[PDB]
Curated annotation (Swiss-Prot), chain B:
Its EC number is 6.1.1.21. PANTHER family: HISTIDINE--TRNA LIGASE, CYTOPLASMIC, HISTIDYL-TRNA SYNTHETASE. It is linked to Usher syndrome 3B: A syndrome characterized by progressive vision and hearing loss during early childhood. Some patients have the so-called 'Charles Bonnet syndrome,' involving decreased visual acuity and vivid visual hallucinations. USH is a genetically heterogeneous condition characterized by the association of retinitis pigmentosa with sensorineural deafness. Age at onset and differences in auditory and vestibular function distinguish Usher syndrome type 1 (USH1), Usher syndrome type 2 (USH2) and Usher syndrome type 3 (USH3). Charcot-Marie-Tooth disease, axonal, type 2W: An autosomal dominant, axonal form of Charcot-Marie-Tooth disease, a disorder of the peripheral nervous system, characterized by progressive weakness and atrophy, initially of the peroneal muscles and later of the distal muscles of the arms. Charcot-Marie-Tooth disease is classified in two main groups on the basis of electrophysiologic properties and histopathology: primary peripheral demyelinating neuropathies (designated CMT1 when they are dominantly inherited) and primary peripheral axonal neuropathies (CMT2). The modification Phosphoserine is found at S57, S305. This is Histidine--tRNA ligase, cytoplasmic. L-histidine binds at D118, L119, T120, R145, Q152, D156, R286, Y290, Y291. The gene is HARS1.
Length: 438, 451
């Protein structure tokens, strides 16, 4: 028996926490900027609640009591929360860890316990305003994180259904074909066409029509082009999706995030789940380095719990904080710069021995002034040792107490980086420290 | 949800009333508490959260954010790092209260796992795994026991340092957070395990709750004269000094060592200025098994415990193959009861508790200005202002104003055709109902100044 974190789980070191706090602050400042509420659900539900949901779910031991399970997803707790509280409309964000028992590849992003970061608007509202807002929120956060240039792919579920029927895929092969088409971002169309015809028996005359549609990406001008398409115009659901899309593009143009959006018909994810617009956010090297965010409209899923069977229309977005965390730390790592694990702005030190009690008095005053102060728990620490500690922790200043300095009543402040000393009056010292550090 | 919070409030009120009656409190205060409790009671498929677990409502979250914010600022002020641990650990990792209390996962077809029951065992594992002999950190996370699922707030300092400074700092931090919380007057009681050196201890812990007389009878039932004199006595530094002078305690080295450390600790507290708020009691024996040094427990002044902790050197050593002990001192803050006390206090003021921070809402009385509204709101968002708008083509102005009143939003931005033409925007204070015309450019700056 080795002491280890469970297979698939990880601790978070102070540096990692600092990185995770830095990004969570940006994302939540944006969520609050859009006037969202926040909720929290327990880490486990009753099993009854999750059965019928891929059954890679951790389950607690019976232990006499009724069976329970760690949440594998945020939304089913969301639906339970809305049905339990008799609400059909709410705007909120939930940030919390989820638990799926799957093989974990550390090199790969996969981990058994990982953060999920969701923002949702639920309710019957005029069409597309909430969706446009969701898109704006995605671009705000990714732009603010400064992790390079991003682009957002959007599509619609209805267009996929209509385009696939008109092109000529059967209904039960349709999900499999979609799984193939979605890889066009990471692979080539000759390759997914070979995969489709060869591995899944789809006719080449149906694959080479799906090709003429899916290899097509652009802006609003492509929704107009496809509105003009004779075959597509005939299809009703394709018509619905395109109409919603034309409207969405207009709202984004008002938002000013129009340039960073791309209509792309290759995109096909979460079909079981999404009923309207589907969007994915990816980093740019015009080549995507990975998928950083996702969003969708899922009217069907939220209302499952209600006895009546009423559907609560919902639109939302999920942010891949776990890639964002790694990318941010590596950027720091590439620089090779040390990351502050503490916010201490001053350290109290005395060169001379026997001044420990006085320092304690000084440190307390700083604490009661709301200053982030520290001191070494040694009766007579050496000045050199104290300074090294400051350099390592990134502490900007050192406050030195000396018998000579004390008589004057002044306190000597030395900048660690510049190694320059100034003598300050005790009353002023607090304000001097404040001026020095925000 | 909200109903669940109400139930929690009722459970706390009942406990408080029970404590007050026990303390032989005056009728005037007891009646007020009963009145609050009665009001709470009045206020109070098969979809349900698992037993012992409750959801957090937006209103509930707001109280939690404010409370956590105060605690977090204090921890940061004292220059602590922060660490995170997974929810579950190997069952073997958690081992010698009762083993059965701990939650355990199904076999699955992998190593057996159990949910964290405490936040410090994982910390001990973290230290051993990384081989660290010194760290100052705080950890805020949910713990599971079989409410069964609840938040735990912990601040710990681990390492070898001159005696009593780390211990003194924890008390100062605890006092600092409680005063900041503004939950009223509180006191902290401190004892050392070494000086104290089972069933008597439990009786002793039970002793805090009940009188010595009845308390004395309980001890007899459990079966004392020598023991009784020591337990009743409690106080300050002067009281501490008298005990050392005693010959019996004095001639025992094990007993003697603890007394000396405490004497030293009080001096540090005096420098800090939290000396007045510290109390010495030998009666306290809570968390005796974990502790190898001092005990401290905080009690608010009208379980009844808001904060607790002490020095334990035994745990870090257990994980290490070598078994070398790691000195450590720490504190836990009972943040759930603090949640419900804070929310209750806010309610007394009668001031609204806002679930959102939106500064302003964009609204238009007239028809067909939706696009105009969207552009403006977007500009506000870009500016970093917290703004909203209703997802309606032509919403009515009265409806929008009502939403602001209910949501607590301070201002409403109104767009009119004439206003649009002149370059002005009409800003109306929801509370005052007063209006002003502000040019588009000045709108962002003015909103910030007003808020
Ligand atoms: Cl596949
Ligand atoms: Cl396994």
């Amino acid at each position: 028996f080795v002491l280890k974190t469970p297979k698939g789980t990880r601790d978070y070191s102070p540096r990692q926490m600092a990185v995770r706090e830095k990004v969570f602050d940006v994302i939540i400042r944006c969520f609050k900027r859009h006037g969202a509420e926040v909720i929290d659900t327990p880490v486990f539900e009753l099993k009854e609640t999750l059965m019928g949901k891929s059954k890679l779910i951790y389950d607690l031991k019976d232990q006499g009591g009724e069976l329970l399970s760690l949440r594998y997803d945020l939304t089913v707790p969301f639906a339970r929360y809305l049905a339990m509280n008799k609400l059909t409309n709410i705007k909120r964000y939930h940030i919390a860890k989820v638990y799926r028992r799957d093989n974990p590849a550390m090199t790969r992003g996969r981990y058994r316990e990982f953060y999920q970061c969701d923002f949702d608007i639920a309710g019957n509202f005029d069409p597309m305003i909430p969706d446009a807002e969701c898109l704006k929120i995605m671009c705000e956060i990714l732009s603010s994180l400064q992790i390079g240039d991003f682009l957002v792919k959007v599509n619609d579920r209805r267009i996929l259904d209509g385009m696939f029927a008109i092109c000529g895929v059967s209904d039960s092969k349709f999900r499999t074909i979609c799984s193939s088409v979605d890889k066009l971002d990471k692979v080539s169309w000759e390759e997914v066409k070979n995969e489709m015809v060869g591995e899944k028996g789809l006719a080449p005359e149906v694959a080479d029509r799906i090709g003429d549609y899916v290899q097509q990406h652009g802006g609003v001008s492509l929704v107009e082009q496809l509105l003009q398409d004779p075959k597509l115009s005939q299809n009703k659901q394709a018509l619905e999706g395109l109409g919603d899309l034309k409207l969405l593009f207009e709202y984004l143009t008002l938002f000013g995030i129009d340039d960073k959006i791309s209509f792309d018909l290759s995109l096909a994810r979460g079909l079981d789940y999404y009923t309207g617009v589907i969007y994915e956010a990816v980093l740019l090297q015009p080549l995507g380095v990975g998928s950083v965010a996702a969003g969708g409209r899922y009217d069907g899923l939220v209302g499952m719990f209600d006895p009546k069977g009423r559907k609560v229309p919902c639109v939302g977005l999920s942010i891949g904080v776990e890639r964002i965390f790694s990318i941010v730390e590596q950027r720091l790592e590439a620089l090779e710069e040390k990351i502050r694990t503490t916010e201490t702005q001053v350290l109290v030190a005395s060169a001379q021995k026997k001044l420990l009690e006085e320092r304690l008095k000084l440190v307390s005053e700083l604490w009661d002034a709301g200053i982030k102060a520290e001191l070494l728990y040694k009766k007579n620490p050496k000045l050199l040792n104290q300074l090294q500690y400051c350099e390592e922790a990134g502490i900007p200043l050192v406050a030195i107490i000396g018998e000579q300095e004390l008589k004057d009543g002044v306190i000597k402040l030395r900048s660690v980086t510049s190694r320059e000393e100034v003598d300050v009056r005790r009353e002023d010292l607090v304000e001097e420290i404040k001026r020095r550090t925000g």
